[PDB]
Amino acid sequence: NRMKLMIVGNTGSGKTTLLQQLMKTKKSDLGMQSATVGIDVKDWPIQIRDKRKRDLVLNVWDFAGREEFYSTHPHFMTQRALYLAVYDLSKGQAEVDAMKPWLFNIKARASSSPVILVGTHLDVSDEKQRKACMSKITKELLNKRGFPAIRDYHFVNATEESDALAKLRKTIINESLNFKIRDQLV
Amino acid sequence: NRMKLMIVGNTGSGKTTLLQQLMKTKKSDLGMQSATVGIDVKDWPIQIRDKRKRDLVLNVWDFAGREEFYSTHPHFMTQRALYLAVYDLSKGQAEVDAMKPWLFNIKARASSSPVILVGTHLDVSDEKQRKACMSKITKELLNKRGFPAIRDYHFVNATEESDALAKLRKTIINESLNFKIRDQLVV
């Protein structure tokens, strides 16, 4: 079972930006070993005015092959996964509150999956925001029965390489390795 | 709420080609409602400094928001999906045999999932290949206890517009609109 990394949070919080920067090496660019995307998910809006006025939107899943289909078995979607819960630090401690429904949803979907909390927009946040978010996390999110285990929490500018991002990148790799190894333990 | 269309088959069969032609649609609104991809799935190859067994690949799922994560609940993945099963007609009747493990796998995901069978590469298919495939489908795939309900089967050139491609587009729309119904007759 290839380890899944699930990047969740609210729209605009910097998830795609954060992943871009995490994967940014350009020693080999982004050299994936398949010529085609394994799973392509896109919406297909269909206007059917000849039919009973029902503008139908299909959520289309294009699978490369059997390996990619197999990887979406409910067993694999719900078990072997590290979660990144991403929020915009520049919007303050309200965004930490908004991580709570995410953490309930992660615990429900994937009961064994650990979470790394990532505050983006550090560069456009102030110490008052940094401090209030830090306090709220340690008091209200860390080591709570009913939430995923929170392995670590980071504050990053997701648009650039930095010590804090390298540490996050290290944590995701190390946390992925260690997660795979423990679940083999009896 | 929102039906999933699952396009499945072996690599090189023409799945991505077929979808891009289907989605050219009626040369009207090209507009995709979101500025960003709802679900982006990428492989992240990582070279690790730690020695011994090394070089780990992460399968990364980048979710736009709460609606996209919710949409991947196993309930919707398994109980709200229509399947396009795609094979390369130009490789002959052996590709119809290779659809059988696919149909077993689909049945296991959800007993009630309908499948539309599509043979691509009609344009570079011999007439005898097409006849052997039609015969094999009708004898061995259609109306089988243990396979999904095969609603219809199609032979198309997936690279261009045709009457056959338009009929496939109509079948997908009708099967989407009538998803619950024909299951309800037996169940």
Ligand SMILES: Nc1nc2c(ncn2[C@@H]2O[C@H](COP(=O)(O)OP(=O)(O)O)[C@@H](O)[C@H]2O)c(=O)[nH]1
């Ligand atoms: N200044 C700053 N902008 C960021 C940061 N992270 C994300 N952004 C910006 O936030 C906006 C939304 O980012 P995106 O990756 O699309 O968010 P997503 O919807 O969570 O995938 C974009 O304009 C990004 O450039 C950050 O750390 N600092």
Ligand SMILES: Nc1nc2c(ncn2[C@@H]2O[C@H](COP(=O)(O)OP(=O)(O)O)[C@@H](O)[C@H]2O)c(=O)[nH]1
């Ligand atoms: N001549 C012809 N080529 C096709 C047809 N459908 C797909 N192809 C070609 O088959 C190759 C693989 O197609 P692709 O859509 O990438 O297949 P996928 O791996 O199943 O997604 C490409 O070179 C396509 O142009 C068809 O109906 N006729």
Ligand SMILES: [Mg+2]
């Ligand atoms: Mg995004």
Ligand SMILES: [Mg+2]
């Ligand atoms: Mg899942």
Ligand SMILES: [Mg+2]
């Ligand atoms: Mg493809």
Ligand SMILES: [Mg+2]
């Ligand atoms: Mg499914």
